Scaffold this active site. Structure first.
Site, PDB file in Angstrom:
ATOM      1  N   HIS A 107      86.371 144.138 133.345  1.00 38.19           N
ATOM      2  CA  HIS A 107      86.573 143.963 131.875  1.00 38.19           C
ATOM      3  C   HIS A 107      87.688 144.877 131.365  1.00 38.19           C
ATOM      4  O   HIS A 107      88.434 144.483 130.510  1.00 38.19           O
ATOM      5  CB  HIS A 107      85.261 144.221 131.113  1.00 38.19           C
ATOM      6  CG  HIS A 107      84.106 143.451 131.615  1.00 38.19           C
ATOM      7  ND1 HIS A 107      84.021 142.079 131.421  1.00 38.19           N
ATOM      8  CD2 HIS A 107      82.955 143.865 132.187  1.00 38.19           C
ATOM      9  CE1 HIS A 107      82.885 141.655 131.919  1.00 38.19           C
ATOM     10  NE2 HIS A 107      82.219 142.743 132.421  1.00 38.19           N
TER      11      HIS A 107
ATOM     12  N   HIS B  42      88.438 154.256 128.058  1.00 41.80           N
ATOM     13  CA  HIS B  42      89.014 152.962 128.508  1.00 41.80           C
ATOM     14  C   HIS B  42      89.893 152.474 127.357  1.00 41.80           C
ATOM     15  O   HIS B  42      89.867 153.030 126.261  1.00 41.80           O
ATOM     16  CB  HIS B  42      87.943 151.942 128.868  1.00 41.80           C
ATOM     17  CG  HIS B  42      87.021 151.657 127.709  1.00 41.80           C
ATOM     18  ND1 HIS B  42      85.936 152.439 127.386  1.00 41.80           N
ATOM     19  CD2 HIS B  42      87.066 150.692 126.729  1.00 41.80           C
ATOM     20  CE1 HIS B  42      85.396 151.991 126.245  1.00 41.80           C
ATOM     21  NE2 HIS B  42      86.128 150.931 125.823  1.00 41.80           N
TER      22      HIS B  42
ATOM     23  N   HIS C  15      91.429 148.654 125.395  1.00 41.65           N
ATOM     24  CA  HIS C  15      91.509 147.204 125.154  1.00 41.65           C
ATOM     25  C   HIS C  15      92.949 146.886 124.815  1.00 41.65           C
ATOM     26  O   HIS C  15      93.573 147.637 124.094  1.00 41.65           O
ATOM     27  CB  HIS C  15      90.552 146.809 124.015  1.00 41.65           C
ATOM     28  CG  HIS C  15      89.142 147.254 124.178  1.00 41.65           C
ATOM     29  ND1 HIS C  15      88.170 146.425 124.715  1.00 41.65           N
ATOM     30  CD2 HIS C  15      88.567 148.471 123.937  1.00 41.65           C
ATOM     31  CE1 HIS C  15      87.048 147.117 124.741  1.00 41.65           C
ATOM     32  NE2 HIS C  15      87.229 148.365 124.318  1.00 41.65           N
TER      33      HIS C  15
ATOM     34  N   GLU D 101      90.969 146.283 118.833  1.00 34.62           N
ATOM     35  CA  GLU D 101      89.697 145.736 118.367  1.00 34.62           C
ATOM     36  C   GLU D 101      89.561 145.987 116.868  1.00 34.62           C
ATOM     37  O   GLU D 101      89.409 145.046 116.103  1.00 34.62           O
ATOM     38  CB  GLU D 101      88.569 146.431 119.161  1.00 34.62           C
ATOM     39  CG  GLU D 101      88.641 146.040 120.660  1.00 34.62           C
ATOM     40  CD  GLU D 101      87.348 146.061 121.407  1.00 34.62           C
ATOM     41  OE1 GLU D 101      86.698 147.132 121.370  1.00 34.62           O
ATOM     42  OE2 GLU D 101      87.018 145.037 121.954  1.00 34.62           O
TER      43      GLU D 101
ATOM     44  N   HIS E 192      89.451 154.005 123.655  1.00 34.30           N
ATOM     45  CA  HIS E 192      88.092 154.395 123.289  1.00 34.30           C
ATOM     46  C   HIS E 192      87.685 155.558 124.181  1.00 34.30           C
ATOM     47  O   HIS E 192      87.550 155.359 125.390  1.00 34.30           O
ATOM     48  CB  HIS E 192      87.139 153.214 123.483  1.00 34.30           C
ATOM     49  CG  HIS E 192      87.395 152.129 122.482  1.00 34.30           C
ATOM     50  ND1 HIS E 192      86.927 150.812 122.564  1.00 34.30           N
ATOM     51  CD2 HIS E 192      88.036 152.232 121.262  1.00 34.30           C
ATOM     52  CE1 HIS E 192      87.224 150.195 121.469  1.00 34.30           C
ATOM     53  NE2 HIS E 192      87.961 151.005 120.640  1.00 34.30           N
TER      54      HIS E 192
ATOM     55  N   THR F  51      81.354 147.387 121.504  1.00 36.90           N
ATOM     56  CA  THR F  51      82.143 146.150 121.282  1.00 36.90           C
ATOM     57  C   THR F  51      82.115 145.227 122.483  1.00 36.90           C
ATOM     58  O   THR F  51      82.743 144.167 122.391  1.00 36.90           O
ATOM     59  CB  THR F  51      83.596 146.494 120.987  1.00 36.90           C
ATOM     60  OG1 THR F  51      84.185 147.029 122.193  1.00 36.90           O
ATOM     61  CG2 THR F  51      83.711 147.423 119.794  1.00 36.90           C
ATOM     62  N   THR F  52      81.307 145.493 123.488  1.00 38.87           N
ATOM     63  CA  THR F  52      81.066 144.603 124.618  1.00 38.87           C
ATOM     64  C   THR F  52      79.556 144.414 124.737  1.00 38.87           C
ATOM     65  O   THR F  52      78.800 145.297 124.312  1.00 38.87           O
ATOM     66  CB  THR F  52      81.610 145.139 125.940  1.00 38.87           C
ATOM     67  OG1 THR F  52      80.850 146.259 126.368  1.00 38.87           O
ATOM     68  CG2 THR F  52      83.061 145.496 125.884  1.00 38.87           C
TER      69      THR F  52
END
Ligand SMILES: NS(=O)(=O)c1ccc(C(=O)N2CCN(c3cc4c(cc3F)c(=O)c(C(=O)O)cn4C3CC3)CC2)cc1
Ligand SMILES: [Zn+2]
Length: 258
Positions: A62, A92, A94, A104, A117, A196-197
């Site tokens: 992911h 991590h 995004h 996000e 994040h 958010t996942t």
């Protein structure tokens, strides 16, 4: 048929396995800068990363996680909206397929190229798995990335990505200093939200820095050469691993700054 960021398994599908996807404190959100209220009661934000111990970098299918030793109070986040001590466990990102999307959170509907994040857990719950079951269990420090000048403190991350191209690959990643990923200013917005996942648990105090960091086109291009797939599987580039903004509902976004 696992969750992901495709047409068939992406954010619009998550609610079927994870009904909290339509809950009262989901993340991310659009930050309306004109509606966020300065909160003079917000204490100073304390990012103490001098003793941070990075261990490993993992492609989890992911994103990629830079993991830290959280077995003691080394790298911690305190103050701001937080009560007590939150231990850094991992960071991590995004990111997008192109520079005009990838974050996000959004700012007045503006999408950044990417979002970092830095994930921390409340030490009063003893371990991360217990913390994610609590409304105040996690604090995630969110930092926007824009494309411009290179971020020197990011290059050690960019240069290891070749070695973790596919899902389930990891590499030793010791002596990485996350202080090299912060902007100058710690001005921030804060609100109560969620992971958010999947499983989208409503356990996060979000702290989103106003000041983005700049990364180079060459740096973000290396993010986009990663793979969602495992080794030997048809190549699916790891891009657009972001969840869109969710309804704010009965929440106020508070600003640390005038
Ligand atoms: N984009 S973001 O929002 O920043 C963000 C998104 C994801 C993550 C993340 O890394 N994960 C999400 C949580 N996920 C979970 C772990 C859980 C449990 C529940 C969990 F959802 C339990 O209920 C449980 C138990 O004791 O019963 C135990 N564990 C731990 C021992 C394995 C671990 C992985 C972090 C940040
Ligand atoms: Zn995240």
């Amino acid at each position: 048929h696992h969750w992901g960021y495709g047409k068939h398994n992406g954010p619009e599908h998550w609610h079927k396995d994870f009904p909290i996807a339509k809950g009262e404190r989901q993340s991310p959100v659009d930050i309306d800068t004109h509606t966020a209220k300065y909160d003079p009661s917000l204490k100073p934000l304390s990012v103490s990363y001098d003793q941070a111990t990075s261990l490993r970098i993992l492609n989890n299918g992911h994103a990629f996680n830079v993991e830290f030793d959280d077995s003691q109070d080394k790298a911690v986040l305190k103050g701001g909206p937080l009560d007590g001590t939150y231990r850094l466990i991992q960071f991590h990102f995004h990111w997008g397929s192109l520079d005009g999307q990838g974050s996000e959170h959004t700012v007045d509907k503006k999408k950044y190229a990417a979002e970092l994040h830095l994930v921390h857990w409340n030490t009063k719950y003893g371990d991360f798995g217990k913390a994610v079951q609590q409304p105040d269990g996690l604090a995630v420090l969110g930092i926007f990335l824009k494309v411009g000048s290179a971020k020197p403190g990011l290059q050690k991350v960019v240069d290891v990505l070749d070695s973790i191209k596919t899902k389930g690959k990891s590499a030793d990643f010791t002596n990485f200093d996350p202080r090299g990923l912060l902007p100058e200013s710690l001005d921030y917005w804060t609100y109560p939200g969620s992971l958010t996942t999947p499983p989208l648990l409503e356990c996060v105090t979000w702290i989103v820095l106003k000041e983005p960091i700049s990364v180079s086109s060459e740096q973000v291009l290396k993010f986009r050469k990663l793979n969602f797939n495992g080794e030997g599987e048809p190549e699916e580039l790891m891009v657009d691993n972001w969840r869109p903004a969710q309804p704010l509902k009965n929440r106020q976004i508070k600003a640390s700054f005038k």
